[PDB]
Amino acid sequence: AHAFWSTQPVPQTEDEDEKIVFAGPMDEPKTVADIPEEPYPIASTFEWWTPNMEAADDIHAIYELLRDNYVEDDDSMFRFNYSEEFLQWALCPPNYIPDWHVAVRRKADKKLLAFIAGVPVTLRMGTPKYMKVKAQEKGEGEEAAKYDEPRHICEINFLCVHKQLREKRLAPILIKEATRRVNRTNVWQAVYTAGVLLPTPYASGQYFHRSLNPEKLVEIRFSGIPAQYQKFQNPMAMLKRNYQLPSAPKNSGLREMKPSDVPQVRRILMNYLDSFDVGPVFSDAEISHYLLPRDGVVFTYVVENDKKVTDFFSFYRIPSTVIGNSNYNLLNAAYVHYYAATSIPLHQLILDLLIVAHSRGFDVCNMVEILDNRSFVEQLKFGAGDGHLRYYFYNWAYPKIKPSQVALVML
Ligand SMILES: CCCCCCCCCCCCCC(=O)SCCNC(=O)CCNC(=O)[C@H](O)C(C)(C)COP(=O)(O)OP(=O)(O)OC[C@H]1O[C@@H](n2cnc3c(N)ncnc32)[C@H](O)[C@@H]1OP(=O)(O)O
Numbered sequence: 305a306h307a308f309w310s311t312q313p314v315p316q317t318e319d320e321d322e323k324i325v326f327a328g329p330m331d332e333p334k335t336v337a338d339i340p341e342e343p344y345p346i347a348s349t350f351e352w353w354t355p356n357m358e359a360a361d362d363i364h365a366i367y368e369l370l371r372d373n374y375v376e377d378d379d380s381m382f383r384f385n386y387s388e389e390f391l392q393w394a395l396c397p398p399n400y401i402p403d404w405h406v407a408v409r410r411k412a413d414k415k416l417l418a419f420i421a422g423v424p425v426t427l428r429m430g431t432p433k434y435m436k437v438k439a440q441e442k443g444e445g446e447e448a449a450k451y452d453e454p455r456h457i458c459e460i461n462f463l464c465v466h467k468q469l470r471e472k473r474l475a476p477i478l479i480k481e482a483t484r485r486v487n488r489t490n491v492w493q494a495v496y497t498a499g500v501l502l503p504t505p506y507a508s509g510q511y512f513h514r515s516l517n518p519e520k521l522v523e524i525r526f527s528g529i530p531a532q533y534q535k536f537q538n539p540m541a542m543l544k545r546n547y548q549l550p551s552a553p554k555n556s557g558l559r560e561m562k563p564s565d566v567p568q569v570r571r572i573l574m575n576y577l578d579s580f581d582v583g584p585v586f587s588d589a590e591i592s593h594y595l596l597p598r599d600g601v602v603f604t605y606v607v608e609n610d611k612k613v614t615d616f617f618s619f620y621r622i623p624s625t626v627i628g629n630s631n632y633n634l635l636n637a638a639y640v641h642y643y644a645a646t647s648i649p650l651h652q653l654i655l656d657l658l659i660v661a662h663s664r665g666f667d668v669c670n671m672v673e674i675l676d677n678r679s680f681v682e683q684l685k686f687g688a689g690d691g692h693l694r695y696y697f698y699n700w701a702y703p704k705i706k707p708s709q710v711a712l713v714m715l
């Protein structure tokens with residue numbers, strides 16, 4: 305049973321998801337005037353707080369909460385340690401709404417207890433291709449096309465309750481208050497991902513990992529030496545050999561992205577993401593924000609030969625705290641972000657991603673099997689992990705799609 309999720313406008317079961325044939329809202333159309341202006345009620349010893357995600361101290365406060373209380377693996381070996389610079393980048397994109405950054409603090413001494421954050425996204429979330437075909441076959445083209453235009457909605461992330469406050473039904477209250485603040489802004493859908501299975505994803509993909517520093521990954525037990533390698537005299541030497549990379553990129557004309565690259569990168573990215581059922585639409589301002597290099601946060605390279613940009617890739621950094629190991633404090637992970645290839649095969653473009661990430665001291669390259677990420681898995685020696693990222697909408701009925709039909713990278 306789901307005492308909270310059963311009350312919310314999301315599909316309730318997989319069986320229900322199979323009956324969905326058109327994109328559209330779940331709930332009753334409602335107005336901003338219908339939405340309470342007073343904050344959701346909360347216990348008298350707590351209070352709502354809106355941190356300023358551009359202000360160093362407030363960013364540091366939220367950073368500490370997440371550092372100590374955000375996503376861990378099941379064996380409490382690793383915990384995400386999103387940096388302060390990362391949080392300001394993720395949470396303050398163009399036209400962000402400060403009121404969508406929602407915290408709870410203990411009233412007496414202002415102890416920070418919980419967080420949830422929304423950001424705007426312009427999303428294509430109309431009926432997927434395979435379902436539009438079914439609609440044509442049945443003379444239902446019109447209903448299937450009703451919500452084809454890209455929508456201005458909310459992306460939700462960084463939901464976090466302090467370890468001491470777990471299993472007290474605080475997460476639902478955060479979710480209700482975030483919903484209220486978003487609805488007051490006349491937005492009625494959200495998109496979110498989680499590693500856990502909730503009612504009810506519209507897509508799911510496995511995580512994949514590419515070892516860059518296998519000796520450290522084995523040391524911290526992110527990886528082990530696979531059985532097959534025990535037939536060698538030095539299993540770790542062979543493992544290191546297996547994962548060795550060039551020390552400099554191989555593509556002629558690879559360089560870091562510059563502000564002047566924004567229009568070309570926008571063009572080639574938007575052309576590419578069009579091929580997917582669910583994907584973001586990005587303005588120039590949003591391309592600049594999400595793709596221009598930021599030290600320690602996001603790294604973006606373009607292939608420019610003979611004064612023209614033909615390809616690009618981007619990756620972002622999230623270190624994870626290594627909880628139990630004494631010798632290392634962090635696992636430095638690079639995550640595959642947006643990319644587009646027009647001049648070279650995708651594997652040739654992404655090999656340079658691995659090369660750059662390795663040169664910069666990253667330990668592993670991670671991604672979900674979205675976009676065309678499957679197309680380079682084997683050649684570049686990615687392996688599936690035990691994790692899955694599930695993709696959800698709030699208040700949006702959506703036919704189940706494959707993860708290779710998802711083009712929205714979730715941070
Ligand atoms: C229109 C605008 C709409 C805006 C809102 C869109 C919706 C956004 C929804 C949020 C998208 C977040 C995207 C991300 O950030 S995913 C990252 C989530 N964060 C973590 O995993 C950090 C570590 N864990 C925690 O901080 C806590 O365990 C959390 C906060 C996750 C739950 O705290 P706690 O463990 O103390 O439990 P509770 O007693 O307060 O509450 C129990 C209820 O919460 C349901 N639950 C558990 N985990 C999740 C989860 N990841 N998404 C949604 N719901 C979740 C659970 O099924 C149960 O409901 P029900 O099964 O009884 O029905």
Ligand SMILES: Cc1nn(C)c(C)c1NS(=O)(=O)c1c(Cl)cc(-c2ccnc(N3CCNCC3)c2)cc1Cl
Pocket residue numbers: 375376377382383384461462497498499500511624635637670689690691692693714715
């Ligand atoms: C290195 C490491 N550090 N940590 C903390 C872990 C769990 C690992 N192991 S992992 O790499 O193999 C991996 C990774 Cl990265 C991520 C998740 C996961 C779980 C829940 N949710 C998300 N969302 C990402 C998008 N925003 C919303 C939440 C990701 C699961 C695994 Cl299992």
